[PDB]
Amino acid sequence: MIRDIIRMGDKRLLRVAPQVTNLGSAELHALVSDMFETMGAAHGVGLAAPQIAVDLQLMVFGFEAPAVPLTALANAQIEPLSDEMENGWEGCLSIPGLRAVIPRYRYIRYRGFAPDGSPIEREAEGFHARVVQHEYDHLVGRLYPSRIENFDTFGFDDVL
Ligand SMILES: O=C(O)C[C@@H](Cc1ccccc1)[C@H](O)SCc1ccccc1
Ligand code: NI
Ligand code: NI
Ligand code: NI
């Protein structure tokens, strides 16, 4: 079922989310399936549960069309594997119509759980890594405008 995505300005995007504790449940399977459908209708590559006003450590991401594997990730934890940063374009479904250039870690490891309870641990780079970092920020109440360094790159998609 498609859910409403809340927009920047909503206090619900500024929370730090608690852990998922119903791995393998029907309830969690239903929420994940709704998040994939939601992400798909909005033409996203990532979506975090706080963006649909669900206060949990849970994100979906991915796309066929470099491809990033379709993933649902609960209780994520991330770590940089070097200090190397890379600039790239980002937008956000809770900030419709805008983009900016944002520095992120080029290389990371992330760990958490698939909805069925299986552990997930992967090394990621480039675009894969960026998506994960961007969604992770939602879980700790951060949006990308707080990370812009060059405000000349912040603007409307149709205009830039
Ligand atoms: O709003 C979110 O939290 C989901 C974003 C994820 C994103 C993260 C990093 C870089 C780009 C996007 C939305 O998917 S934005 C739509 C989009 C689609 C393809 C390429 C770029 C942006
Ligand atoms: Ni469509
Ligand atoms: Ni976002
Ligand atoms: Ni490589």
Residues in contact with 30: Cβ distance below 8 Å, sequence separation at least 6, in sequence order: none
Q: What is the resolution of this structure in A?
A: 1.9
Of ligand 1's atoms, which has the minimum distance to the CA of residue 44?
14
Whether ligand 1 lies within 6 angstroms of the CB of 130 is answered as yes
Token pair in block for residue 12 = 């619900």
Kindly tell me the burial class for residue 139, based on how many C-beta atoms sit within 10 Å of its own C-beta (0-12, 13-18, 19 or more): buried
* CA of 130, closest atom in ligand 1: 9
Residue ranges making up the domain that contains 118: 1-160
- CATH no. for residue 141? 3.90.45.10
Q: How far apart are CA 109 and CA 30, in angstroms?
A: 27
Count of domains forming the chain: 1
Pairing outcome for strands 98-105 and 107-113:
unpaired
Per the structure block, which two tokens stand in for 152? 């000349």
From which experimental method does this structure derive? X-ray
Torsion angle defined by CA atoms of residues 61, 66, 69 and 73, in that order, rounded to the nearest 10 degrees: -40
Active-site residue numbers? Answer: 135
